[PDB]
Design a protein around this nucleic acid. Structure first.
Length: 223
DNA sequence: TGTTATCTT
DNA sequence: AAAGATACA
């Protein structure tokens, strides 16, 4: 065991030598000497430690990670006991309460339970300097995570991709929109959520597309 | 309430 | 580029 799960290391290690990646791993080191970066070094790739890459079924992609203390733990939008759900997570559950029937507020914000079933919880960018949104954008993450969308797009079928916000949506042009199912919408944040997120029914539409495909529906209450 | 997203310059 | 103006807890 270690920061990457083995099944992803296998299909990603090829970025490890490319200069944009030597550079980015250097850049964020400098950030950690001089500010607090979220998440902390060992949590940055938690999105790999949840299931075998070939077991992935849904991809929920966000902007970047949470940037308040003790929040971002590598799984997009997720937060760990004790931490309370942030607005974006509070909101999410709201859509789920009216989109999905049986679903009731989990009482905590830890979303590991989904990523075990095959939901890749990712953000376009994976680090954030404290208290400043998208602060680590255009630094070489987007390209690395593109390897991650590329590989799925290449080596899997009938994946549901859920693209939350203007920034997540940028991966869109790289997905085969026939091979896969791309559901795009306004980012769950209170700064936006009215732009479409509430009413988007992204959770139910996922299962719908998953069952027609012989695959198992994601059990969203399983948190 | 504070959201820190998004559209526009 | 970076920044000002803009519906529910």
């Amino acid at each position: 065991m270690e920061f990457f799960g083995e099944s992803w290391k296998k299909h990603l290690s090829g970025e490890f030598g490319k200069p944009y990646f030597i550079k980015l791993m250097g850049f964020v080191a400098e950030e950690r000497k001089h500010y607090t970066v979220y998440p902390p070094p060992h949590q940055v790739f938690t999105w790999t430690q949840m299931c075998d890459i070939k077991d992935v079924k849904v991809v929920i992609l966000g902007q970047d990670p949470y940037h308040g203390p003790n929040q971002a733990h590598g799984l997009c939008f997720s937060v760990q006991r004790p931490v309370p759900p942030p607005p974006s997570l509070e909101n999410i559950y709201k859509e789920l309460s009216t989109d999905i029937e049986d679903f009731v507020h989990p009482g905590h914000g830890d979303l590991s339970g989904w990523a075990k079933q095959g939901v890749l919880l990712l953000n376009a960018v994976l680090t954030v300097r404290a208290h400043q949104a998208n602060s680590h954008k255009e630094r070489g993450w987007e390209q690395f995570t593109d390897a991650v969308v590329s590989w799925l797009n290449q080596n899997s079928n009938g994946l549901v991709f859920l693209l939350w916000g203007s920034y997540a949506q940028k991966k869109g042009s790289a997905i085969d929109r026939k091979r896969h199912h791309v559901l795009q919408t306004a980012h769950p944040s209170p700064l936006s959520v009215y732009r479409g997120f509430f009413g988007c029914r992204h959770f139910s539409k996922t299962n719908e597309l998953l069952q027609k495909s012989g695959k198992k529906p994601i059990d969203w209450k399983e948190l």
